Amino acid sequence: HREEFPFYWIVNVYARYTQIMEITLKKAQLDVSGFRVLMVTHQYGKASISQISEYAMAKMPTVTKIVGRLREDGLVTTEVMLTDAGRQKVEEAMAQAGKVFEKGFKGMTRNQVAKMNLSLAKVLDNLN
Amino acid sequence: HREEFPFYWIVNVYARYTQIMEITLKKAQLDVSGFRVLMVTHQYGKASISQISEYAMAKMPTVTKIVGRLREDGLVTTEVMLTDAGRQKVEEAMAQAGKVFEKGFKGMTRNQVAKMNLSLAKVLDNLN
Ligand SMILES: O=C(O)Cc1c[nH]c2ccccc12
């Protein structure tokens, strides 16, 4: 097979990555959406559905059904919402994901990884 | 929001890309799976489900249900399968996708795009 397809590796890294994070986070009782929604709220501290909905990679009616599973499970509480022993869920989650990122970027320099992410961010400006 | 997440841009380029290709290929009567299954067969000329199933980003029972929609629509025929006026479907498809790739990589050098895809292929070796 040929890369006559400039997005071949975006897609393949994305699929192998999603696959690994599905089974890793099932250790920590989470799916990827659940894990993204917690992390957006974590950086914001207290977040709106509109704001989560920007970054979690989901239209607001998924986020609202996601945030409501996480309300009911004592990981988020509080319009605006905030983390609880979610703060412990995100330690658990990022410990697992840190193993995934460590394996992922092994043998790659800091500058390689930065130039890759700079180039990818130019692809996104262009698609937007 | 912070990239304390080295895959933030893989995922965002992947989501904006999938979004654009969904609506572009609906011009040409195709979804992305249909478009990938045709292209794998095209490079192979005549391909098995096992072989398509490697590259199309789908487990074999999707590919087998995908190849059967494309059998029934005169885009693939022939164990092994091959393109027809599929050969015309792939001109139509890659014309559209070439507009997507042209916009995508605008203002980026050939070497930038190659180094990005080399780095991404190291991420995949590592995840595999
Ligand atoms: O979707 C893309 O452009 C990348 C890609 C991954 N697998 C493919 C198989 C056939 C055609 C393109 C792709």
Ligand SMILES: O=C(O)Cc1c[nH]c2ccccc12
């Ligand atoms: O899935 C990833 O690792 C990337 C990513 C995209 N949006 C996110 C929101 C919160 C946490 C991580 C991500």
